[PDB]
Design a protein around this ligand. Sequence first.
Ligand code: HEM
Ligand code: HEM
Ligand SMILES: Oc1cc(O)c2c(O)cc(O)c(O)c2c1
Ligand SMILES: Oc1cc(O)c2c(O)cc(O)c(O)c2c1
Ligand SMILES: Oc1cc(O)c2c(O)cc(O)c(O)c2c1
Ligand SMILES: Oc1cc(O)c2c(O)cc(O)c(O)c2c1
Lengths: 399, 399
Amino acid sequence: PPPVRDWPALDLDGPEFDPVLAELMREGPLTRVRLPHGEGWAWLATRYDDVKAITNDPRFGRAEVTQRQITRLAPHFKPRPGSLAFADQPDHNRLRRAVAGAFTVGATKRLRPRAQEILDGLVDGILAEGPPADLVERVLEPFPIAVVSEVMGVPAADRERVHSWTRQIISTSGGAEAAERAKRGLYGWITETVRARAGSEGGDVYSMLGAAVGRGEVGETEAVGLAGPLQIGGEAVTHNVGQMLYLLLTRRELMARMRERPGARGTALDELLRWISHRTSVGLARIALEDVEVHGTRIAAGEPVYVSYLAANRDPDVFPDPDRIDLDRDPNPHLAYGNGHHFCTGAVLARMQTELLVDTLLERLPGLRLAVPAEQVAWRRKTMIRGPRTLPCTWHHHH
Amino acid sequence: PPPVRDWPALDLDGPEFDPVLAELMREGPLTRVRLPHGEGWAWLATRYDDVKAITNDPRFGRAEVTQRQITRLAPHFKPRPGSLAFADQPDHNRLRRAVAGAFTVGATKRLRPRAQEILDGLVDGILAEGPPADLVERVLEPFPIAVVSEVMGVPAADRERVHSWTRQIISTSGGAEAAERAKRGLYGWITETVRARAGSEGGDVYSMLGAAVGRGEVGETEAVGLAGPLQIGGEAVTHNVGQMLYLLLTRRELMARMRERPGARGTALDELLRWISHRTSVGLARIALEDVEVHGTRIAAGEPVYVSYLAANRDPDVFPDPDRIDLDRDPNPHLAYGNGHHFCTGAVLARMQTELLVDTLLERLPGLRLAVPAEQVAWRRKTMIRGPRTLPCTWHHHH
Ligand code: HEM
Ligand code: HEM
Ligand SMILES: Oc1cc(O)c2c(O)cc(O)c(O)c2c1
Ligand SMILES: Oc1cc(O)c2c(O)cc(O)c(O)c2c1
Ligand SMILES: Oc1cc(O)c2c(O)cc(O)c(O)c2c1
Ligand SMILES: Oc1cc(O)c2c(O)cc(O)c(O)c2c1
């Protein structure tokens, strides 16, 4: 049994891969780690095959972590009822039916036109005002909030409120209770809205979920836990796309490539998803229910195991020159959105948003580039999801 | 003619009546003043009868002011086309018809129910969080803007954007170049919104304006000047009511009076409007069109003339014991909203908003009191409209 490994929190002002995670990947296909909080240590799969396996083997459960105190990254751990993250079959499957409808390819394709309009409105704004604009605050943050509020079914009279609440994405940590405050309201709002819509025939989430509730498909107690994440999910697109524009803005070569292929940015966008370190460490562990051996390691039942999709995505035996950014990279089977039934509920929704963002920004902000040195862009700290806090930009205007 | 009097802008942290305006009021009915900017001096009428007459006489025009550089309180003066303020018959009339229908008594009543729910939501918020709350930022600031964006007809997904921009009201000012930024965005949005809605039946201001534009009744170029003031006109409510409450929170007698007369606060709200010095100095002057003589004084054609509704409102001959906040006051024909064709377009809307705030706040926040000593409440400086910048309050919460 390899020694336990201390794994601190990252303090790097950039997209660089975690130096301490680089270590463990070299230590062996399975390691034991001690995160900033919680008690004890946990296993960590680092290899692609191992990662893809664990994540899809019924032998490991998520439900059992709620009932414990496995070492984690977050200081606090209070799992809500109904969260897809900690639901196992047949529960994970049940809860999913009350919301997955509005997250399908077809529902995303149906949503695309409206989304493009919202994005274009935010773009008109920065364009009317003139050249110096913080893209994060003016486009990356609000755009995802707005599109998702469409998917969720947020009523008109409450667009501003839910927008403002959700805008508790924080500048980084601009408030401990100041964020609990926003969640407090939002969650009171959601529980109510689900009560209303007891049995409405709506394709939007807040109706489907409502109906399912008033029909015992998913009675209350599971509302917030099921809808909270989705309603707040947009923030994930804000950071990730934030990282992509940063790379584009500081690596002129990539920007070039991206501008040269309108209509064929697919592989480039997938190469960015693979390379970028979306999370700071590892989260959402799994519990080894009935004693198992992983890649030659013995994992006794009851012991927690973390998987690193970031590490997996740099698997030498799966992605040659894994550290190099390709953009044209062949099939590219990255695990950015996870693997299994816990696969990202918003994978497709998030991908369509990323596309509009990259396409609209390159089309409508010519001469786009950092308004200040890269070194001046601060990065989020003490957060699960990595990303730039701002992205000051300039672009051509008038002589 | 009387000597030219220098009337500086003043820094008064409280609702006190402008002292220099007090000196000017006893110096006689028609004095001459020199405001901080512009060129030369201007006539100033202080008597009720003179103020009402001058304000209703066709021999005084507003348009001509747009061509001159009359002494003024504002550092820069750049009148926009389509402005009711500076439009004379028939333009003023033509402009008003295109938007006035949304500010009628009947329209306000129809709006009332919805305004109440908006206010109740904001109040739910502070009640949920607990006592310490700055009434200005949490209620008086957002309430007016929200109701006015309903009256104006802002989408919903755009509301959050309009408000953010509209906040070019800030606190005294957060920046000049920044203010001319927020409106660069807001006025671009207004222009575009109006262009769309070319053919619209809508009751909205934007919609009605767009139909008038398309019909060439008040075509483009005039849109921003006409709608701009209305879209941002809500702050007038934010600051006037801020003064009302400040008086209630610092003068027990007043508070007890208002709390003991629910359903009959009518004369008390009017007395506040009369007493409260809503703006600093005087603002929109008129040009003498055909040489006139007022209250004995001869004003040569071409000379500018300012009137003071605040001074008119303290006329001993019309309001015995003028400086005493009486309430219960008989007719009380105060001119807080001006008089004549330029009468406040939003008089009724503002009044309805004021009735809801006072009523809802007194009812929903039992024991409402300042959380800090009065002297800690800071006041707006270098600003046309007067008012408290914040109102930290507390109220009965728990055992
Ligand atoms: C491109 C940005 C995004 C990335 C990279 C991403 C990535 C991921 C990953 C890796 C997981 C699985 C974690 C695990 O099980 O260990 C996940 C789960 C999830 N994501 Fe995302 N996500 C993104 C955007 C979103 C958005 C916009 C939403 C909401 C509309 C969302 C909702 C969810 C939910 C609800 C889960 C839990 C699924 C379950 O376990 O049943 N994600 N995401
Ligand atoms: C209780 C708060 C308010 C007070 C005390 C007030 C007072 C006044 C006064 C005294 C005038 C005349 C200025 C002059 O000619 O010297 C005026 C004009 C005007 N006000 Fe207000 N107002 C208030 C709220 C509002 C609101 C909320 C709006 C927007 C819906 C608004 C829109 C206007 C417009 C457009 C004019 C110019 C009218 C014209 O010349 O045709 N006001 N107001
Ligand atoms: O709706 C929530 C979302 C979260 O991310 C939460 C969290 O991270 C920690 C908690 O203690 C919570 O209670 C959380 C609640
Ligand atoms: O509701 C969640 C959405 C996500 O995208 C998550 C994620 O990407 C990684 C996690 O460890 C999570 O716990 C996530 C939870
Ligand atoms: O609310 C305002 C918006 C403007 O664009 C203004 C302006 O351009 C010139 C003025 O003198 C103003 O007083 C203006 C006031
Ligand atoms: O265009 C204006 C709108 C207002 O609400 C005004 C006001 O409230 C007070 C004034 O002295 C004004 O001069 C005002 C002018």
